[PDB]
Design a binder for this molecule. Structure first.
Ligand code: J3U
Ligand code: J3U
Ligand code: J3U
Ligand code: J3U
Lengths: 390, 391, 392, 389
């Protein structure tokens, strides 16, 4: 009755206005699901549900998860639903799957997340019943539904300056963390460490998109020191110590260990612990701390027991606060780099981080990992994960 | 370890361009949650999660469920997430809660759904990177993300004409079903049968909105026969045998029976069975049939054992196909009327139907009910529900 | 006999903002006036050399509003047409344009007027062609961007008029008195039937409604009620929704020709154009524009202010009426005698043609001999015509 | 009492999404007016009026002509108004000036036209009072207010296929006319023949925009034969035998000959005749024919007396129909190329064609020219023009 992750796969991550700008989030997910089914040879009839994270659902059409399922080639008999816990959404899909299997509602779920920030439409709140007289606003949905706090209407980056102030996170420390994320990601990418987990996407000439494109390998802390604050005049957060506005998808099979063995799957990770926590919306970057403590308590693990922490780099400041609050060794925190380098396709990111850890533990023979994401609105999600031997 | 529903409550349902047109879906949910907490006296710290259904999330701001939780007065320590299984979303929130409790992730969840179709914005897909030259479309989000099939871009009502054709559902039968829904709802409303489940909403313009406003009590099958088809030239589906574009919210506590007793709650329903099924998108109206069979199989019930079926009236045609395919007695199908009368606020409707059944079984002493909804894209959700006696 | 005359001046009633004409394009209002003008005059359509129409909010009205007015008005496709824009002066400019075409030998007979429908002005999306890229973007109300906001400052005409108020020491109390008097004079004139002769009713299909009476006026207006209103354009201002006109819709048109041409074709001339003035001033003091324009028109006519029976000066704001009246020393009883735009409305591009129409009919009724029509113009201009009644 | 054109000047013409895409039409006009005043040394107080053509007025702000005048450095005492006779607008501004001078309203007018088709906004007709339910359209103003017929809502190019059908204008003839326009324009441009009339524009790095950019010198009849019809499935009109969606401005001084001499101006052209005509909207391409006949009748000229015709290339098909109906020698029709090559910035084009002819007659010592434009909605405008020594 161990719940395991099998066949975790992801697209490469697109840059803002980059290679995936014309490819809907649901099409990215459908491509990963189609590929997962063809590579595993899993009988499509054994899929009980598709669960997908997606934050910017505006204009994506009815129920993104059902589009991912049907356009991914699954039989129309497979149900599907879409979950939204903001940046946690792609990890939430896997927690949702775990709950459905443990509760007896499902035996096997395809879970993941999708996002395409270019494909987020503009919103016209006054178009239905009229603006009447005077200028009116068209809202960028990626700000209104994705990155701005629902209570303040301030950017997540504006709020994170209060986390920076509270934990005395220097500009210099943020830029060092960001430069290190770029350097670690570039070295891992050059070593071929992401080839196994990436499903190339054909863009119609045809272009094969096979490599993460959002990263800047030549980044130095000295170069980052030159950038202007992006969110407050006297701020520390810049375009260089924050991730971009990215596109991508990831998906994986969630089942009991027995079900995976029965159907000839090769489990990658066992879910040993799950944590979901919430904090003040204004201090959302702290969310992973209580979430990780809950996941570690379920797994009966100490911080010192964990080979690697994979914590989303929503901002360098959030990575530093979570790492230092929990006393995690810098060499065991975002070992192969994070979202500052590869990008943060909101609803997909949690599924991407699970995918990275599945493949990294197999490569390194590391035994124990934690995946965690901070969540706009003041939440955190964490999974404690153990490598399954072949 | 029985999973029970306590303190199910709902707003009245707003008409399109009606009383709730300026009240965001998240504010409707927050109002229900705030009221549920004050009436139950439930310690807010005992709420482990808020799960809310919402289909038209466009322009509602970051994570509707978290807005419902925080604006409902729950501590910032209570996590929240939003689910979307289209018309099933408000029932899905309760299934999600059940799964979290049975799997040990949660002990007590506030679950429900919210929708406001007036508040759905228009979408401009070409505004980010430009239309360049030539006219461009601004899409109505309630069609693009709610009512149009994602595969065909045809209205759910257009697709339902193929269900009508396949099951030979006459225009006359659809209009009789619709007139009966209006008549049953009007009589139940006049008897005061919805007063207990409704939390009035104060609209500052202040006026108190306390009564469902979308229904048409004077409806007759003869009157409905005069209406033009809404979705196809040779169609049977009209504005009169389909629900409106409505607004509302509903929420309830989901917990083990033991947890409910421990915290001084009065359980209304025990969840005896859950069914989630999927079919051809083009025949989505059939979805409740396999879903109901799954829920009844988990409950070890036969159709004839059930006191009332509460099946969403997405169209009169869908109600008739589901009722007649399962051989349900017409007097036990949507007993107090359905969405044709009271409205279909998409993401809230499943939570509203659970709320109606919770209060109807208490009033009637009926023991066994099924709530089911068809789902755009070809799905169905069903819960088999048993009345819990007063302690 | 080579004197230039106005014949058969006619107008629609003026619609309120979000009122009876909200679904009727400006070009359709003009077409309706032209159709009626042709049937009442019996003018052979082939004798029309050109149609000139004022229109300020051209956005979304389709190619060349004047040509739509002409063709939809039932004129042969052989009749040329063009649209002029001198903002609030546009409807009077069309008549000056006609005068210049006739005096220069380009035309013998012109149908001139103006059209506007402020409800029908669309919103503009400047960022939709090439994209907003990231972050919120503005949809502009065209009636502000192209009609009422100054092109240099982007401030409302009403914001700028507060500087005219300061310079000419125009009290809030004086503005509210002027506004109350405009409402009272217009309501009395309307009730007496004094606008029935000049108005062409419009049938609106909804059932059908016959729109036959100006609807934008507020006869119950009091100085006490006006004193309670908040300043509309500056927090410590004097200009309010009550001492300014609305956002209105309407059309007017008339025949311009030599007196000899009018007689030849069996038309009944109403007015002789005795003088024309077009002037410009500081954009921020545009309300003063009529003063130099009126002086130019009076100089051409060889008239003194005291020779003029009535001044018809557009009430863009009560403040503008007061400045023009008091600067020229005009008797209050001879200034906007039958009320003005504060009461009946200001359908921008039509207003100048409406004021010429009002004066044509008022001089006939009263046997007054001499009038001046003048309008202030956003961007700092003024237009004026000195007009003499033609005897029958 | 001869009415003359002096100091005709223009910007280079921008391509669609090209160098002028961020520069408002009124700013292009202001730049030409500022340069005209510096070069002539004309006392700004001697300008009685500014008249500007502009067709896509949507979003340009209150009264484009007044913005051109004030931003061009004219005193606030100079009145200004904007005219719209669609593609004829830039020539109409000069006719308007002529009428104001002959009627005694004005002694000296700055007249011209401005257009920037990139800068034309999208329109939302349903945003004021609401779309209520169901998808709604955002209209491209350049189609709604500029290029689509107001009666049919069909593109001018769609209507011109009926002119093509009526006059049996072959695809091959249209592509030959278009290739010849490109070849003639490229050769004239390379010879420096447009340098005198062009006022360069600096766009902020900086771009110094000094040369027309919309033309395609490598155009061949063989290449044009490969293009798909743009307006009808079995049509003849393509992106290659029609002009683009362009930006530019032109302006000139209009006055009596005596006034020009008095103020030390150098007259370029005398207006000898003016024609304004109208036809069935769908066959608007024919409009120049009756308009040219009116202008020639006022000038007491025959077609054979005219050294060059400058007729707007709204479509190759329109140029061919006008040329062949009037029996004009192909070597005397759009001699230095036309809008297919250099572009058609709607409201400016008529003023641009007057500017081209002013400078071409000075260079060639040709005596007599006609400028004419077809006009959407079924109109035509023509001026008969004589070189001043
Ligand atoms: C749900 C928790 C969260 C979050 C987040 C985040 C951070 C996004 C970074 C962005 O705001 C900007 O830095 C992107 C700058 C865009 C630069 C560009 O134009 O591509
Ligand atoms: C997710 C499954 C589903 C569904 C559904 C549905 C039915 C919606 C009915 C409405 O589309 C129609 O009644 C149109 C409403 C007309 C009201 C109006 O025009 O104001
Ligand atoms: C060309 C020169 C000029 C001018 C002018 C003007 C009009 C000012 C009044 C308007 O701006 C506003 O008061 C209209 C108020 C609208 C309120 C409403 O109808 O809801
Ligand atoms: C007022 C009379 C007229 C006219 C006209 C015209 C012709 C317009 C040509 C354009 O429609 C064509 O260039 C098609 C536009 C191609 C757009 C592009 O460059 O992508």
């Amino acid at each position: 009755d161990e719940i395991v992750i099998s066949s975790a796969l992801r697209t490469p991550i697109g840059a803002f206005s980059g290679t995936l700008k014309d490819t809907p989030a649901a099409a990215l997910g459908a491509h990963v699901v189609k590929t997962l089914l063809e590579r595993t040879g899993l009988a499509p009839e054994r899929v009980d549900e598709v669960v997908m994270g997606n934050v910017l659902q505006a204009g994506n059409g009815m129920n993104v998860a059902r589009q991912v399922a049907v356009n991914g080639g699954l039989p129309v008999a497979v149900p599907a639903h879409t979950v939204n816990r903001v940046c946690g959404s792609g990890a939430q899909a896997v927690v949702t799957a775990y709950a459905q299997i443990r509760s007896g509602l499902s035996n096997l779920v395809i879970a993941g997340g999708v996002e395409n920030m270019d494909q987020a439409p503009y919103l016209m709140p006054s178009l239905r019943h009229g603006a009447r007289m005077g200028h009116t606003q068209a809202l960028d949905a990626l700000l209104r539904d994705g990155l701005n706090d629902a209570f303040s209407d301030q950017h997540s980056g504006w709020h994170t300056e209060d986390l920076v102030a509270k934990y005395e996170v220097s500009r210099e420390a943020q830029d060092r963390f960001a430069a290190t994320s770029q350097q670690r990601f570039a070295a891992a990418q050059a070593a071929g460490w992401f080839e196994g987990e990436i499903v190339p996407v054909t863009i119609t000439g045809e272009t094969v998109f096979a490599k993460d494109e959002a990263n800047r390998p030549d980044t130095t802390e000295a170069g980052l020191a030159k950038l202007r604050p992006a969110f407050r005049k006297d701020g520390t957060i810049t375009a260089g110590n924050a991730p971009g506005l990215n596109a991508g998808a990831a998906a994986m099979i969630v089942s009991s260990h027995a079900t995976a063995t029965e159907l000839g799957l090769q489990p990658q990770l066992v879910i040993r612990g799950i944590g979901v926590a919430a904090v003040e919306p204004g201090l959302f970057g702290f969310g992973p701390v209580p979430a990780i403590k809950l996941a570690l308590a379920q797994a009966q693990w100490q911080v010192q027991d964990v080979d690697r922490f994979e914590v989303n780099e929503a901002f360098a400041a959030v990575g530093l606060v979570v790492r230092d609050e929990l006393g995690i060794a810098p060499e065991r925190f975002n070992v192969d780099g994070g979202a500052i380098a590869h990008g943060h396709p909101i609803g997909a990111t949690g599924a991407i981080l699970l995918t990275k850890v599945a493949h990294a533990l197999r490569r390194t023979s590391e035994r124990r990992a934690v995946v965690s994401l901070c969540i706009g609105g003041g939440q955190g999600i964490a999974l404690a994960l153990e490598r399954v031997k072949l």
